[PDB]
């Protein structure tokens with residue numbers, strides 16, 4: 001009956017020692033008749049108990065969305081440990097077990113390059129600065145924008161795309177007021193990946209050279 | 210279980226350059242031995258055309274047939290978003306299979322180019338890769354190439370146009386040269402052909418600086 005989905009820790013969260021990474025176990029199609037879900041967490045086959053039990057969410061299709069969240073400790077997710085979730089419920093003949101771990105294989109650093117505003121864009125009220133992040137592995141990556149030491153949160157980063165070479169590429173687009181770009185303000189592009197030095201790289205772009 | 214039709218578009222280079230002749234191809238597969246009669250009808254925006262060359266049937270390795278019809282386009286016709294139909298008729302199918310293609314409708318957007326040099330892992334091996342990121346273009350119809358000192362470099366690979374949240378398209382292109390050629394100081398160019406561009410062309414260069 002119910003379906004189980006196991007989600008990895010937010011890429012930013014696994015890369016900064018100053019964050020709360022957590023694996024997430026989601027159970028959709030839980031009956032209004034048998035709502036209880038017992039969760040069992042395993043870490044490299046060893047049962048852990050620290051999991052956080054989250055209150056069920058009534059979905060509009062008259063079913064519940066039960067979730068459990070196990071916090072990971074950085075040095076474990078990046079070090080390829082296997083996080084197993086065992087979902088037990090009355091409406092299941094036998095428990096559902098799901099497993100997640102970071103993608104194995106040679107870590108490859110991303111390469112960044114920037115795109116200043118377009119020929120048409122520069123005639124509009126708002127302009128867009130873009131970032132191209134190519135050839136990183138695994139797809140676990142954080143793309144943020146910041147200007148003058150302050151977070152610039154009006155951007156859209158595309159989801160990682162696989163290449164014929166076996167690595168990923170994405171595109172980030174920050175949209176800002178034309179007036180700000182013309183004033184020669186300097187906007188940067190932050191990329192976080194396990195293969196970068198100090199897990200981070202940044203690429204600035206302005207009206208100036 | 211019957212015959213199958215696939216309708217192919219003219220190459221982006223043929224459509225926006227005085228290079229070769231642009232054609233729209235209609236490929237029919239699974240043509241049975243007992244039902245060989247394949248009738249091809251062509252419609253440019255509703256208007257049936259007879260300037261259609263059908264390549265005599267080809268005996269496939271799995272013992273089927275591959276019948277292909279070719280229609281030549283009057284260059285500007287594809288770019289002007291003219292719709293092409295292929296009504297394939299066969300005895301083996303209950304009713305004719307009609308497939309319709311045209312250049313993607315909606316206002317065009319210019320590609321933005323970005324060059325990336327070799328990475329840390331690349332400059333260790335005998336060969337180095339030089340990437341080229343292209344984004345923001347619409348329609349997907351694009352032609353990416355490489356050339357150095359004027360001669361085309363043909364050991365490259367380009368990803369298919371990926372779709373952005375903002376309905377624009379993007380791709381990355383990777384050229385694999387010899388470390389010695391990059392190291393020598395030689396300059397490599399990324400040639401991007403698209404209708405939204407001025408003179409349907411833009412280049413982007415990189416060298417060892």
Ligand SMILES: *[C@@H]1O[C@H](CO[C@@H]2O[C@@H](C)[C@@H](O)[C@@H](O)[C@@H]2O)[C@@H](O[C@@H]2O[C@H](CO)[C@@H](O[C@@H]3O[C@H](CO[C@H]4O[C@H](CO)[C@@H](O)[C@H](O)[C@@H]4O[C@@H]4O[C@H](CO)[C@@H](O[C@@H]5O[C@H](CO)[C@H](O)[C@H](O)[C@H]5O)[C@H](O)[C@H]4NC(C)=O)[C@@H](O)[C@H](O[C@H]4O[C@H](CO)[C@@H](O)[C@H](O)[C@@H]4O[C@@H]4O[C@H](CO)[C@@H](O)[C@H](O)[C@H]4NC(C)=O)[C@@H]3O)[C@H](O)[C@H]2NC(C)=O)[C@H](O)[C@H]1NC(C)=O
Pocket residue numbers: 003005007008009010013020021022023024026028029059060061063065
């Ligand atoms: C009743 O309705 C519910 C809900 O309705 C839904 O929502 C409403 C609003 C409508 O839009 C409606 O149409 C929707 O249906 C139904 O529930 C849905 O059920 C389906 C399956 O039946 C689920 O589909 C899977 O989605 C996965 C991705 O889910 C994410 O993205 C969607 C869409 O963006 C979101 O809605 C989800 O919430 C998920 O988002 C993630 O959520 C996490 C937890 O909140 C986040 O993680 C945490 O984030 C926090 C911060 O908030 C911290 O930072 C933590 O550290 C961090 O862990 C996470 O960030 C967030 N991400 C995003 C992007 O937002 C898919 O991956 C999955 O794919 C598989 O599906 C098929 C399974 O066989 C199949 O197609 C494939 O196999 C496919 O691929 C698998 O997965 C991976 C792929 O990489 C690979 O391993 C394999 O290829 C393959 N493996 C396996 C073993 O399968 C599904 O498509 C859907 O998520 C779910 N919705 C919700 C809300 O949970 C319900 O089904 C309906 N009932 C009935 C009877 O049908």
Ligand SMILES: *[C@@H]1O[C@H](CO[C@@H]2O[C@@H](C)[C@@H](O)[C@@H](O)[C@@H]2O)[C@@H](O[C@@H]2O[C@H](CO)[C@@H](O[C@@H]3O[C@H](CO[C@H]4O[C@H](CO)[C@@H](O)[C@H](O)[C@@H]4O[C@@H]4O[C@H](CO)[C@@H](O[C@@H]5O[C@H](CO)[C@H](O)[C@H](O)[C@H]5O)[C@H](O)[C@H]4NC(C)=O)[C@@H](O)[C@H](O[C@H]4O[C@H](CO)[C@@H](O)[C@H](O)[C@@H]4O[C@@H]4O[C@H](CO)[C@@H](O)[C@H](O)[C@H]4NC(C)=O)[C@@H]3O)[C@H](O)[C@H]2NC(C)=O)[C@H](O)[C@H]1NC(C)=O
Pocket residue numbers: 215217218219220223230231232233234236238239269270271273275
């Ligand atoms: C028995 O054999 C036959 C023959 O097969 C061949 O021989 C056997 C022995 C094997 O070796 C086999 O590998 C060989 O292919 C079998 O027939 C095959 O059947 C499958 C389907 O079952 C066909 O698959 C589709 O292919 C499309 C792409 O085809 C190109 O690529 C293949 C390689 O994979 C080539 O072999 C083809 O020749 C095609 O190549 C293109 O050909 C054009 C015409 O020649 C070229 O254009 C012209 O070029 C000249 C220069 O030469 C000029 O420049 C002109 O200007 C120019 O027009 C073009 O260059 C060339 N391109 C390339 C890339 O090479 C796929 O597109 C298609 O996928 C779509 O459809 C799927 C469903 O079928 C769908 O799931 C996908 O998502 C996808 O997209 C969707 O499609 C649907 C419609 O189908 C749409 O509604 C959707 O909108 C659409 N979505 C999107 C987002 O677009 C298929 O994968 C296969 O091609 C065919 N073989 C051949 C040779 O045609 C038969 O199956 C066997 N029997 C059995 C029992 O299996």
